[PDB]
Paper text:
We selected two SenB-like enzymes, CbSenB (GenBank: RYF17368.1; 65.5% sequence similarity), which was derived from Comamonadaceae bacterium, and RsSenB (GenBank: MBC7468551.1, 65.2% sequence similarity), which was derived from Ramlibacter sp., for further functional characterization. Like SenB, CbSenB and RsSenB are located in the SEN biosynthesis-related gene cluster. Catalytic activity analysis revealed that CbSenB and RsSenB recognize sugar donors like SenB and utilize UDP-Glc, UDP-GlcNAc, UDP-Gal, and UDP-GalNAc to generate the corresponding selenosugars. The catalytic activities of these three enzymes for UDP-Glc, UDP-GlcNAc, and UDP-Gal were similar, but RsSenB utilized UDP-GalNAc more strongly than SenB and CbSenB did. Mutagenesis assays confirmed that the residues equivalent to N20/T23/E231 of SenB are critical for acceptance of various sugar donors in CbSenB and RsSenB. Unlike that of SenB, the asymmetric unit of the crystal contains two RsSenB molecules. The monomer structure of RsSenB is very similar to that of SenB, with an RMSD of 0.99 Å for Cα atoms. The spatial positions of the putative catalytic residue K158 in RsSenB strongly overlapped with the structures of SenB. In addition, the mutagenesis results for the catalytic residues in CbSenB and RsSenB were consistent with those for SenB. These results not only provided two other SeGTs but also further demonstrated the universal effects of the key amino acids N20/T23/E231 on the promiscuity of sugar donors and the putative catalytic residue K158 on the Se glycosylation of SenB.
Numbering used by the authors: 2 to 11, 20 to 287, 292 to 329
C-alpha cells in the first residue's frame, strides 16, 4: 500500500534525514548492502557514496537497469573517486538520476553525466542567532585535518595575525593526518589566540558554529560543505575559499571569498571583519551577514523534503 524505498549507506546525516522525510508516504529502510532480507518489493534505490556502495548499485542495475536508481554525489565523489576508482565512476553511469548538493556540482561532470544531474541542497533547522561580544572577533573553522581541507592556510593566517590580540581562531577537527596535527599543535604553541579543539561531537560543533562571529572554510574542493549550511542557518557568516563547491553554497555575488591558499588575504579579511564590530567602522561584516541571510532559504527542510519527494516520484 506504500512504495518500498531503499537508502543504501555504509538524525542530521543524509541517510537519516532522508529516511525521516520519506517515512510518511513510503516504506523506507536504510541498509548497507542492497539485496538484503526485506528487498523483494523495492521500487526505488537511493545510494550514497558511490565507491563504497558500488556492489549494491550494480546489483540493482542487474535487476532493474537504471529504473528507480539515483546516486547522490559529494566532493569526494566528484573530484577524487570518479577519476580514480573505475567502479565508482561506473556507478554514475548506472544511475537513473544523479544528485549534487549545490548548483555548481554538475560542472565537475562530463556532459553525458551532467544531463541527468539535478541539484538538491541539504537542509537543517534554523537556529536563533547567538549574542556575541564586540570586544573580540572569534572565528571558527571545522573539518578533520586532511590536506583537502587546507588547514595550513588557517595556520599561516594565525601566524600573520599574532600581533592582533582582539582576533581569535578556534579550530575543530580530528587529527586524521598526524603531520597536519603536529602543525596544529605548533601553531597553538606559537600563537596563543589560535586554539585547536580536536574532534568534537556534532552537537557541540553545531553550537560553536552558532556562537562564533564567523566560520572560515578554506578547502581546496567541496561538494557542498555541511558546515557552511549550518553557519548560514545559525546567523554566522562565512569567509570561504573561492572554489566552485563554496560558490554554489554562498553565491556568485558573495563578498566573503578569498583566493584558495592565500593566507594573507584570509588574514586581511579577518582584520576587516574585526573592524566591523561595534555605526561600524567597516561595512564588510554586516554585508556578509545580510548576504548569508539571503542564502538561508535554500536550506529550509521543507525545500529539501519537496525536492526529495519529486525525485522519488520521478523514479517510480
Amino acid at each position: 500500500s506504500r512504495p518500498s524505498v531503499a537508502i543504501v549507506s555504509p538524525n542530521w546525516q543524509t541517510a537519516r534525514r532522508w529516511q525521516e522525510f520519506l517515512d510518511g508516504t513510503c516504506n523506507v529502510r536504510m541498509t548497507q548492502r542492497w539485496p538484503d532480507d526485506g528487498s523483494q518489493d523495492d521500487v526505488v534505490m537511493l545510494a550514497l557514496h558511490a565507491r563504497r556502495s558500488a556492489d549494491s548499485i550494480e546489483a540493482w542495475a542487474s535487476v532493474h537497469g537504471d529504473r528507480g536508481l539515483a546516486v547522490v554525489l559529494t566532493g569526494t565523489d566528484l573530484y577524487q573517486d570518479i577519476v580514480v576508482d573505475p567502479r565508482a565512476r561506473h556507478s554514475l553511469e548506472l544511475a537513473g538520476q544523479l544528485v549534487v548538493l549545490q548548483d555548481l556540482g554538475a560542472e565537475a561532470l562530463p556532459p553525458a553525466l551532467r544531463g541527468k544531474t539535478r541539484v538538491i541542497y541539504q537542509s537543517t533547522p534554523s537556529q536563533a542567532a547567538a549574542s556575541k561580544p564586540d570586544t573580540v572577533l572569534q572565528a571558527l573553522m571545522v573539518g578533520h585535518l586532511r590536506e583537502v581541507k587546507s588547514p595550513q592556510t588557517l595556520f599561516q593566517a594565525a601566524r600573520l595575525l599574532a600581533g592582533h590580540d582582539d582576533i581569535r581562531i578556534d579550530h575543530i577537527g580530528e587529527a586524521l593526518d598526524p603531520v597536519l596535527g603536529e602543525q596544529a599543535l605548533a601553531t597553538q604553541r606559537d600563537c596563543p589566540n589560535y586554539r585547536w579543539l580536536g574532534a568534537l561531537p556534532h552537537d557541540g560543533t553545531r553550537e560553536r558554529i552558532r556562537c562564533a562571529h564567523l566560520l572560515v572554510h578554506a578547502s581546496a574542493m567541496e561538494g557542498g560543505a555541511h558546515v557552511i549550511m549550518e553557519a548560514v542557518c545559525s546567523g554566522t557568516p562565512v569567509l570561504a575559499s573561492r572554489i566552485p563547491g563554496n560558490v554554489g553554497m554562498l553565491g556568485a555575488d558573495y563578498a566573503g571569498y578569498f583566493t584558495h591558499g592565500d593566507a594573507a588575504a584570509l588574514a586581511a579579511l579577518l582584520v576587516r571583519c574585526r573592524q566591523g564590530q561595534a555605526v561600524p567602522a567597516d561595512p564588510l561584516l554586516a554585508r556578509l551577514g545580510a548576504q548569508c541571510a539571503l542564502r538561508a532559504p535554500l536550506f529550509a527542510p521543507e525545500a529539501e523534503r519537496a525536492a526529495l519527494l519529486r525525485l522519488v516520484a520521478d523514479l517510480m
